[PDB]
Amino acid sequence: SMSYTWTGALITPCVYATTSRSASLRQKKVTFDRLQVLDDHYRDVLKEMKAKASTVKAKLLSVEEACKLTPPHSARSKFGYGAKDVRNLSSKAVNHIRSVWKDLLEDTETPIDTTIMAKNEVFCVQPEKGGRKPARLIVFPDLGVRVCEKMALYDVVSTLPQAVMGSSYGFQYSPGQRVEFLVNAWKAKKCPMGFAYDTRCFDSTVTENDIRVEESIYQCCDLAPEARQAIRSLTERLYIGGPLTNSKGQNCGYRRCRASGVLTTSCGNTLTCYLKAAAACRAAKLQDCTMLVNGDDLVVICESAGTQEDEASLRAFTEAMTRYSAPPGDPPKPEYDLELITSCSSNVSVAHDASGKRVYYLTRDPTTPLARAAWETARHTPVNSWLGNIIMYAPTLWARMILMTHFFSILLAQEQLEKALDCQIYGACYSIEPLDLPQIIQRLHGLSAFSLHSYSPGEINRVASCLRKLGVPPLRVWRHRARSVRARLLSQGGRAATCGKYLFNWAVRTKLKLTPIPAASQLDLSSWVAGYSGGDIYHSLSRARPRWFM
Ligand SMILES: O=C(O)/C=C/c1ccc(NC(=O)C2(NC(=O)c3ccc4c(C5CCCCC5)c5n(c4c3)CC(=O)Nc3ccccc3-5)CCCC2)cc1
Ligand SMILES: CNC(=O)c1c(-c2ccc(F)cc2)oc2ccc(-c3cccc(C(=O)NC(C)(C)C(=O)Nc4nncs4)c3)cc12
């Protein structure tokens, strides 16, 4: 069937940023009929997956438990109540949720309406690479449905993917753990080879059968009968597809593929992609495959059988994936250095800590993080990629020298260090206090993140070239600026001084010996686990039992 059908009704809205005018170009790309042929390899992997799912027990979340997970800036309900009312357990919201739930338990076929919108993403615009890129589409049900999804499937999506995929489940890793997995995977092979597999419009390639296969995996859990019916009804009425409505309330068409704004988007895409990829590994007869699946993103580390054999295996892998209804965007390239694989726009690099020891870390081209940050300083935005980039890429030269320096000088100038901000980062929305960045960074990357030096020439040159291209002052200017920022932060004591000490040690002539932050142990990061991209999940950072002297 067709991934989408359109009535022709325009997608209405509620460093450059893509608008809902360029959404028409995206519609042509994402619209196509799907051809899917399955085999024994696919059925075998599926059964092995289902067998692992069988070990899972999932709790049914209460109205309140589910309400408390709602982001405060989550799109308001067309039934006149919003994220705040939900979070506050307002009788109108709670009563409207209890009815949506009842309807899911009682109505098994009626499609649920979804809202289609364009996601305004800030970019740079490379004139050498060609032209502009279209805006991505966000398909999501009403607030009431969204709370019900959490009641039925939050515990499923939090525990099932790791039970099924184990170490292959990307979303379970902090950036430091992800790198540890990749490096060990690489080191474990006699002669390693690796590649990234990028599917052309993954959500669109997802068939209504793919969606039932994943409900079949969810159905292996020990579920409460209401959770079972909710999963069943949500599959038929929402996940397999339904009608598309713009912000103006007009019908835009109909969908028969993955909805990007549902709780099961990351989880379902991970399971689906893993299933197809593990099946394709067998079809292409790759030896000793290690997979890292992160939503629609895939990295395979296998055993090299020689340049010509490896190229042959990859073509076979692609042919299998295509049959499974997962054709590639760009055909995969085999790589013989781990640092050469690019996935989730990232690559593994190496540096030294304070004692000369090697430390691996994730990095990426800084152009987009810098442009988005340049836009975010220019105009107030409710979701800051800059803070997600600091947290995600804390060990990188560019996050430390440019992002940290620039934004702490602004927070200093606005006496807003204490003010919690909402940060994006791939999936879920996080409420983070900039003053907590050192503990966060220590927890996610290690104390070494504050002592990294001896960066590779390639990384240094990438960062420097990028600054020149974007009209950003050079690294020597940033070192100067970070010395004032540091000085002013130190003079403020407490967490602010820790920000100056730890985050800006790189800027001082004679380096300070940095001890582990004591308060880093008391931060609760238990929730940080799974990917909830479109999942509408809110996690505000908390600390159990704070020691007074902190
Ligand atoms: O050779 C030497 O010895 C010294 C050279 C040198 C060169 C330029 C300056 N510039 C400045 O001081 C000013 N801008 C900046 O000091 C500035 C800071 C951050 C900037 C950023 C981003 C960086 C990431 C965080 C958000 C801010 C961008 N641009 C920046 C400019 C350049 C700009 O204007 N816009 C963009 C556009 C896209 C990408 C980045 C930028 C402030 C007053 C005059 C302009 C200072 C020193
Ligand atoms: C298959 N591809 C991959 O696995 C990735 C590769 C890659 C690159 C090159 C390779 F040769 C291989 C793999 O680079 C990546 C960069 C980022 C992400 C990512 C995506 C989603 C969440 C988080 C995350 O870390 N988010 C934060 C809140 C910062 C976090 O800390 N999350 C946590 N989640 N649980 C505990 S902590 C990170 C994933 C990949």
XYZ file of C-alpha atoms and ligand atoms in Angstrom:
637
model
C 0.000 0.000 0.000
C 0.904 3.733 -0.259
C 2.873 5.138 2.737
C 0.689 8.303 2.490
C -2.291 9.658 0.571
C -2.946 13.369 0.350
C -6.073 15.413 -0.144
C -3.825 18.332 -1.157
C -4.660 20.350 2.025
C -1.497 22.274 2.932
C 0.538 21.442 6.062
C -0.410 24.428 8.226
C 1.893 25.867 10.971
C 0.625 26.622 14.537
C 21.803 29.662 9.980
C 18.347 29.086 8.359
C 15.294 27.169 9.660
C 13.117 24.996 7.310
C 9.422 26.128 7.243
C 6.054 24.426 6.305
C 6.372 25.934 2.717
C 9.211 23.434 1.850
C 7.118 20.543 3.348
C 5.686 19.809 -0.194
C 9.135 18.546 -1.433
C 9.238 16.086 1.540
C 5.706 14.743 0.639
C 6.922 13.464 -2.812
C 9.937 11.637 -1.193
C 7.927 9.961 1.698
C 5.021 8.881 -0.681
C 5.362 5.453 -2.405
C 3.798 1.944 -2.493
C 5.721 -0.752 -0.512
C 6.989 -4.070 -1.890
C 7.912 -6.563 0.884
C 8.991 -10.238 0.417
C 9.863 -12.300 3.563
C 12.002 -15.461 3.915
C 13.056 -18.192 6.365
C 15.922 -16.092 7.778
C 13.433 -13.301 8.654
C 11.040 -15.862 10.321
C 13.917 -17.542 12.204
C 15.256 -14.234 13.688
C 11.668 -13.216 14.513
C 11.122 -16.451 16.503
C 14.501 -15.994 18.351
C 13.415 -12.397 19.163
C 9.885 -13.506 20.344
C 11.523 -16.170 22.597
C 13.534 -13.414 24.374
C 10.424 -11.101 24.582
C 8.634 -14.007 26.390
C 10.909 -13.379 29.441
C 9.484 -9.860 29.908
C 6.745 -8.805 32.458
C 5.326 -5.246 31.925
C 3.424 -3.112 34.467
C 0.381 -1.057 33.475
C 1.053 2.602 34.471
C -1.655 4.480 36.439
C -3.282 7.750 35.133
C -1.063 9.810 37.546
C 2.182 7.846 36.749
C 1.506 8.506 33.024
C 0.474 12.194 33.581
C 3.701 12.935 35.540
C 5.743 11.712 32.422
C 4.156 14.350 30.171
C 6.506 17.165 28.934
C 5.193 20.609 30.130
C 5.408 21.984 26.563
C 3.648 18.924 25.029
C 1.002 19.976 22.398
C -2.339 20.817 24.063
C -5.391 18.627 23.583
C -8.052 19.594 20.996
C -10.442 18.824 23.945
C -9.432 22.058 25.720
C -6.691 21.124 28.253
C -2.903 21.108 27.949
C 0.319 19.568 29.295
C 0.139 21.715 32.519
C -3.421 20.462 33.410
C -2.270 16.828 32.797
C 0.897 17.329 34.944
C -1.322 18.920 37.668
C -3.882 16.068 37.547
C -6.741 18.463 36.559
C -10.176 16.719 36.757
C -10.969 17.756 33.138
C -7.639 16.219 31.850
C -7.811 13.074 34.095
C -11.509 12.542 33.117
C -10.730 13.031 29.374
C -7.825 10.468 29.679
C -10.023 7.863 31.515
C -12.526 8.144 28.599
C -9.864 7.762 25.858
C -8.629 4.623 27.716
C -12.208 3.236 28.021
C -12.696 3.838 24.276
C -9.426 1.949 23.538
C -10.696 -0.967 25.624
C -14.093 -0.904 23.970
C -13.484 0.152 20.345
C -11.127 -2.109 18.395
C -11.396 -0.806 14.754
C -12.174 2.943 14.479
C -9.038 4.842 13.290
C -7.697 7.484 15.663
C -6.980 10.895 14.179
C -3.395 12.200 13.979
C -2.016 15.729 13.402
C 0.607 16.187 10.683
C 3.007 19.152 11.056
C 6.373 20.193 9.689
C 9.305 20.094 12.141
C 11.252 23.376 11.809
C 14.931 22.345 11.810
C 17.763 24.850 11.729
C 20.630 24.134 9.275
C 23.686 25.820 7.628
C 23.257 25.477 3.786
C 26.347 24.077 1.977
C 26.549 25.760 -1.499
C 29.151 23.163 -2.723
C 26.967 20.110 -1.707
C 24.032 21.469 -3.793
C 20.847 23.143 -2.543
C 18.431 23.174 0.450
C 16.855 20.176 2.346
C 13.045 19.814 3.034
C 11.371 19.949 6.523
C 10.677 16.623 8.303
C 7.056 15.674 9.143
C 5.755 15.016 12.644
C 2.646 12.779 12.970
C 1.084 12.568 16.424
C -2.245 11.719 18.148
C -3.996 13.933 20.696
C -2.643 14.512 24.228
C -5.287 12.151 25.690
C -4.205 9.244 23.416
C -0.542 10.047 24.240
C -1.123 9.605 28.002
C -2.981 6.291 27.340
C -0.030 5.079 25.173
C 2.228 5.588 28.257
C -0.179 3.670 30.538
C -0.153 0.615 28.227
C 3.377 0.661 26.715
C 5.835 2.825 28.714
C 7.012 -0.186 30.784
C 7.079 -2.322 27.598
C 9.354 0.095 25.593
C 11.602 0.656 28.620
C 12.333 -3.053 29.293
C 11.510 -5.138 26.152
C 14.120 -3.839 23.577
C 17.096 -4.694 25.874
C 15.583 -8.100 26.705
C 15.267 -8.880 22.946
C 18.437 -7.247 21.565
C 20.779 -7.149 24.520
C 24.030 -5.285 23.869
C 22.809 -4.523 20.275
C 20.225 -2.078 21.727
C 21.708 1.391 21.141
C 19.439 3.450 23.418
C 20.621 1.678 26.571
C 24.028 3.436 26.360
C 25.425 6.707 27.701
C 27.912 8.131 25.066
C 30.900 6.654 27.015
C 29.264 3.178 27.199
C 28.369 3.312 23.431
C 32.043 3.924 22.566
C 33.157 1.157 25.042
C 30.773 -1.263 23.210
C 31.974 -0.267 19.730
C 35.669 -0.423 20.674
C 35.358 -3.837 22.365
C 33.293 -5.090 19.374
C 36.086 -3.928 17.016
C 38.937 -5.314 19.242
C 37.052 -8.666 19.551
C 37.468 -9.435 15.784
C 40.661 -11.013 14.295
C 40.441 -8.690 11.258
C 37.471 -6.290 11.714
C 35.286 -4.679 9.015
C 32.339 -2.349 9.647
C 29.641 -0.320 7.877
C 26.665 1.948 8.541
C 23.307 1.104 6.911
C 21.097 4.108 6.274
C 17.544 3.387 5.068
C 15.812 5.876 2.621
C 12.729 7.224 4.615
C 12.745 4.470 7.302
C 9.262 5.410 8.691
C 7.812 5.242 5.132
C 9.440 1.804 4.404
C 7.638 0.465 7.583
C 4.707 -1.678 6.339
C 1.442 -2.353 8.142
C 2.772 -6.004 8.461
C 6.048 -4.703 10.116
C 3.799 -2.960 12.683
C 1.835 -6.189 13.407
C 5.107 -8.157 13.710
C 6.169 -5.705 16.442
C 2.758 -6.023 18.258
C 3.409 -9.805 18.076
C 6.688 -9.211 20.031
C 4.892 -6.859 22.548
C 2.193 -9.582 22.969
C 4.915 -12.035 24.311
C 5.160 -9.878 27.501
C 3.303 -10.715 30.633
C 0.694 -7.956 30.192
C -2.374 -7.010 32.228
C -5.584 -7.668 30.195
C -6.262 -3.889 29.788
C -2.646 -3.318 28.585
C -3.161 -6.238 26.115
C -6.391 -4.677 24.703
C -4.863 -1.186 24.628
C -1.804 -2.496 22.710
C -4.198 -4.402 20.370
C -6.577 -1.452 19.741
C -3.689 1.097 19.457
C -2.072 -1.157 16.860
C -5.186 -1.405 14.650
C -6.555 2.143 15.236
C -3.267 4.142 15.427
C 0.092 2.433 14.693
C -0.794 0.652 11.380
C -2.101 4.021 10.120
C -5.058 6.416 9.972
C -6.283 9.877 8.887
C -3.933 12.974 8.791
C -5.153 16.416 9.999
C -3.330 19.813 9.840
C -3.068 22.404 12.742
C -6.036 24.250 11.064
C -8.231 21.121 11.647
C -8.480 20.237 7.924
C -8.015 16.646 6.599
C -4.598 16.330 4.733
C -5.001 12.697 3.890
C -4.241 9.233 5.238
C -1.121 7.359 6.531
C -0.131 3.566 6.202
C 3.344 3.668 7.702
C 5.136 4.530 10.995
C 3.800 7.613 12.817
C 6.927 9.556 13.925
C 5.202 11.027 17.054
C 3.996 7.876 18.846
C 5.552 6.250 21.962
C 6.503 3.042 20.011
C 8.394 4.950 17.209
C 12.015 4.443 18.513
C 11.349 1.021 20.050
C 9.411 -0.251 16.986
C 11.983 1.135 14.577
C 14.786 -0.484 16.623
C 13.081 -3.889 16.753
C 12.086 -3.701 13.003
C 15.511 -2.540 11.852
C 17.273 -5.128 14.071
C 14.964 -7.900 12.752
C 15.552 -7.040 9.083
C 19.332 -6.492 9.696
C 19.966 -9.732 11.618
C 17.986 -11.617 8.848
C 20.052 -9.803 6.150
C 23.303 -10.741 8.041
C 22.306 -14.408 7.546
C 21.084 -13.915 3.954
C 24.483 -12.225 3.073
C 26.388 -14.794 5.159
C 28.492 -12.132 7.075
C 30.788 -13.727 9.668
C 30.563 -12.920 13.396
C 28.204 -9.912 13.175
C 27.947 -7.422 15.962
C 25.145 -4.962 15.517
C 24.418 -1.638 17.112
C 20.820 -0.570 16.333
C 19.654 2.923 17.323
C 16.131 3.519 15.926
C 16.418 3.533 12.094
C 20.294 3.801 12.477
C 22.378 0.677 12.009
C 26.101 -0.203 12.368
C 27.444 -3.679 11.573
C 30.878 -4.880 12.766
C 31.743 -8.273 11.311
C 34.785 -10.384 10.299
C 36.520 -9.319 7.040
C 36.791 -11.889 4.292
C 38.805 -9.591 2.011
C 38.075 -6.392 0.079
C 36.252 -8.127 -2.845
C 34.320 -10.590 -0.624
C 33.323 -7.734 1.788
C 31.995 -5.669 -1.142
C 30.097 -8.731 -2.379
C 28.616 -9.405 1.146
C 27.462 -5.742 1.416
C 25.627 -5.888 -1.957
C 23.915 -9.110 -0.749
C 23.028 -7.410 2.611
C 21.512 -4.488 0.669
C 19.502 -6.843 -1.659
C 18.072 -8.663 1.435
C 17.202 -5.326 3.244
C 15.515 -4.066 0.054
C 13.391 -7.270 -0.136
C 12.488 -6.739 3.589
C 11.248 -3.247 2.521
C 14.272 -1.323 3.862
C 16.192 -0.061 0.750
C 19.243 2.197 1.306
C 19.572 5.955 0.943
C 23.304 5.766 0.247
C 24.761 2.272 -0.502
C 26.957 1.061 2.404
C 30.770 1.311 2.285
C 33.000 -1.192 4.130
C 35.481 0.389 6.576
C 38.680 -0.995 8.050
C 39.229 1.715 10.784
C 36.521 2.146 13.468
C 37.103 5.956 13.315
C 35.980 5.794 9.658
C 32.394 4.637 10.318
C 29.773 7.505 10.448
C 26.474 6.762 12.264
C 23.949 9.164 13.907
C 26.148 11.796 12.232
C 29.013 10.665 14.519
C 32.495 9.019 14.460
C 34.780 7.634 17.192
C 37.891 9.671 17.859
C 40.761 9.311 20.395
C 42.594 11.720 22.803
C 44.664 11.412 26.014
C 43.602 12.110 29.549
C 45.707 13.955 32.179
C 47.987 10.913 32.691
C 48.691 10.088 29.000
C 46.137 7.265 28.730
C 44.121 6.869 25.503
C 40.428 7.727 25.689
C 37.949 7.072 22.878
C 34.963 9.420 22.374
C 32.223 10.349 19.940
C 32.424 13.479 17.827
C 30.865 14.779 14.630
C 31.246 17.636 12.094
C 30.563 20.757 14.243
C 28.840 22.790 11.411
C 25.212 21.929 12.325
C 25.657 22.055 16.175
C 27.327 25.520 15.728
C 24.737 26.923 13.277
C 21.810 25.711 15.478
C 23.482 27.302 18.554
C 24.020 30.547 16.521
C 20.317 30.546 15.793
C 19.389 29.764 19.409
C 21.450 32.755 20.724
C 19.779 34.960 18.022
C 16.200 34.048 19.019
C 14.526 32.502 22.066
C 13.684 28.808 21.463
C 11.980 26.377 23.885
C 14.359 23.520 23.004
C 18.168 24.063 23.022
C 20.270 21.815 20.843
C 23.310 23.629 22.300
C 22.803 22.094 25.732
C 22.145 18.637 24.284
C 25.343 19.007 22.224
C 27.345 20.016 25.348
C 25.991 16.912 27.186
C 26.334 14.592 24.147
C 29.753 15.914 22.906
C 31.350 17.115 26.175
C 34.766 15.438 25.406
C 35.003 17.137 21.991
C 37.298 20.118 21.355
C 34.433 22.207 19.833
C 31.881 21.607 22.605
C 34.443 22.566 25.260
C 36.140 25.523 23.552
C 33.222 27.053 21.685
C 29.833 25.870 23.026
C 30.692 25.875 26.764
C 32.604 29.184 26.543
C 29.918 31.081 24.578
C 26.901 29.880 26.615
C 28.412 30.155 30.079
C 29.389 33.778 29.259
C 25.723 34.451 28.275
C 24.283 32.720 31.408
C 26.804 34.771 33.482
C 25.643 37.991 31.756
C 21.993 37.124 32.464
C 22.411 35.661 35.984
C 20.667 32.471 34.622
C 23.109 29.694 35.701
C 20.483 28.360 38.216
C 17.604 28.399 35.552
C 16.675 24.873 34.264
C 16.461 24.665 30.467
C 14.708 22.101 28.275
C 17.161 20.289 26.012
C 16.336 18.200 22.861
C 19.054 15.446 22.298
C 17.870 12.868 19.606
C 14.850 11.377 21.511
C 13.257 12.573 24.842
C 13.156 16.158 26.357
C 15.328 16.872 29.435
C 15.089 19.609 32.085
C 18.664 20.513 32.958
C 20.239 23.102 35.171
C 23.498 24.339 33.521
C 25.096 24.255 37.037
C 24.684 20.498 37.009
C 26.650 20.009 33.729
C 29.916 18.865 35.559
C 28.205 16.014 37.483
C 26.215 15.035 34.312
C 29.372 15.067 32.156
C 31.327 13.132 34.821
C 28.529 10.520 34.965
C 28.072 10.188 31.133
C 31.733 10.564 29.923
C 33.979 10.175 33.013
C 36.279 12.533 34.935
C 38.681 12.199 31.849
C 36.240 14.514 29.875
C 37.679 17.465 31.765
C 41.349 16.547 31.025
C 41.222 15.487 27.375
C 44.110 16.713 25.224
C 46.318 15.616 22.278
C 43.384 15.732 19.851
C 43.942 14.259 16.418
C 45.153 16.628 13.612
C 42.054 15.623 11.652
C 39.683 16.710 14.434
C 41.631 19.943 15.099
C 41.643 20.802 11.383
C 37.919 19.941 11.048
C 37.076 22.288 13.939
C 39.353 25.110 12.694
C 38.125 24.893 9.051
C 34.587 24.911 10.269
C 35.062 28.101 12.369
C 36.648 29.858 9.307
C 33.714 28.767 7.134
C 31.103 30.027 9.663
C 32.791 33.329 10.566
C 33.281 32.221 14.212
C 36.476 33.610 15.913
C 39.482 31.187 16.048
C 40.384 28.858 18.978
C 42.922 31.351 20.485
C 40.021 33.881 20.978
C 37.951 31.168 22.765
C 40.827 30.273 25.119
C 40.984 34.033 26.091
C 37.219 34.239 26.613
C 37.159 31.007 28.687
C 39.741 32.461 31.076
C 37.297 35.314 32.045
C 34.343 32.916 32.159
C 36.422 30.589 34.381
C 37.637 33.465 36.680
C 34.050 34.812 37.107
C 32.678 31.272 37.722
C 35.325 30.483 40.384
C 34.525 33.704 42.254
C 30.872 32.562 42.659
C 31.488 29.354 44.633
C 29.536 26.107 44.826
C 28.300 24.504 41.600
C 29.286 27.649 39.557
C 32.882 27.307 40.773
C 32.763 23.569 39.846
C 31.677 24.670 36.305
C 34.707 27.034 36.186
C 37.166 24.481 37.662
C 36.089 21.339 35.714
C 34.620 22.692 32.448
C 37.395 25.235 31.810
C 40.592 23.501 32.983
C 41.618 23.233 29.322
C 41.950 27.078 29.284
C 44.486 27.384 32.179
C 48.263 27.547 31.674
C 49.168 25.103 34.557
C 46.437 22.478 34.953
C 44.671 21.705 38.253
C 44.373 18.062 39.450
C 40.656 17.219 39.261
C 39.130 14.915 41.802
C 35.723 13.173 41.271
C 32.770 15.490 42.087
C 31.191 14.011 45.297
C 27.657 15.223 44.384
C 27.890 13.240 41.050
C 27.000 9.974 42.896
C 23.705 11.381 44.265
C 22.361 12.380 40.714
C 19.503 10.057 39.594
C 20.160 9.133 35.939
C 18.218 5.802 36.023
C 15.719 7.153 33.410
C 18.114 8.611 30.782
C 17.679 3.232 29.140
C 15.624 3.971 25.972
C 14.876 6.224 22.958
C 11.567 8.125 23.005
C 11.956 10.160 19.714
C 8.376 11.301 19.069
C 7.572 9.385 22.290
C 6.710 12.698 24.140
C 8.697 11.784 27.333
C 9.767 14.227 29.983
C 12.568 13.649 32.454
C 13.534 16.400 34.893
C 16.832 15.636 36.700
C 16.672 14.702 40.404
C 18.980 13.715 43.332
C 18.110 11.295 46.160
C 19.376 12.270 49.726
C 21.655 15.402 49.200
C 24.637 15.682 51.638
C 24.392 19.148 53.232
C 28.073 20.269 52.432
C 27.176 20.117 48.669
O 42.388 36.674 14.498
C 42.248 37.037 15.667
O 43.259 37.187 16.491
C 40.895 37.347 16.185
C 39.811 37.217 15.426
C 38.416 37.433 15.815
C 37.419 37.264 14.859
C 36.099 37.579 15.131
C 35.734 38.052 16.387
N 34.353 38.284 16.579
C 33.730 38.910 17.595
O 34.297 39.246 18.614
C 32.192 39.090 17.438
N 31.498 37.800 17.270
C 31.808 36.714 18.018
O 32.611 36.779 18.942
C 31.133 35.417 17.685
C 30.919 34.464 18.685
C 30.270 33.270 18.408
C 29.772 33.035 17.129
C 28.944 32.012 16.537
C 28.275 30.874 17.272
C 29.263 29.795 17.718
C 28.568 28.636 18.432
C 27.710 29.130 19.586
C 26.709 30.153 19.108
C 27.419 31.337 18.464
C 28.816 32.330 15.198
N 29.495 33.506 14.934
C 30.053 33.966 16.120
C 30.734 35.143 16.376
C 29.650 34.111 13.607
C 28.257 34.637 13.289
O 28.018 35.842 13.316
N 27.269 33.738 13.079
C 27.339 32.327 13.155
C 26.625 31.610 12.189
C 26.772 30.237 12.098
C 27.598 29.560 12.975
C 28.264 30.242 13.981
C 28.143 31.631 14.090
C 31.564 39.866 18.611
C 31.779 41.343 18.266
C 32.202 41.392 16.780
C 31.897 40.023 16.247
C 36.717 38.203 17.363
C 38.036 37.891 17.079
C 24.261 2.911 15.487
N 24.650 4.261 15.856
C 24.999 4.583 17.098
O 24.804 3.869 18.081
C 25.640 5.877 17.230
C 26.843 6.289 16.735
C 27.932 5.646 15.995
C 28.881 6.416 15.327
C 29.974 5.829 14.716
C 30.087 4.467 14.763
F 31.181 3.890 14.208
C 29.163 3.662 15.372
C 28.089 4.262 16.008
O 27.090 7.609 17.069
C 26.004 8.041 17.806
C 25.855 9.277 18.395
C 24.746 9.469 19.199
C 23.797 8.459 19.414
C 22.741 8.629 20.447
C 21.386 8.489 20.149
C 20.429 8.608 21.144
C 20.805 8.896 22.444
C 22.144 9.115 22.750
C 22.628 9.681 24.050
O 23.715 9.341 24.515
N 21.822 10.586 24.653
C 22.099 11.159 25.981
C 20.839 11.893 26.448
C 23.281 12.131 25.867
C 22.384 10.064 27.038
O 23.247 10.219 27.894
N 21.560 8.958 26.979
C 21.479 7.972 27.938
N 20.630 6.989 27.815
N 20.746 6.076 28.854
C 21.658 6.412 29.697
S 22.477 7.889 29.351
C 23.106 8.951 21.756
C 23.954 7.235 18.755
C 25.077 7.019 17.955
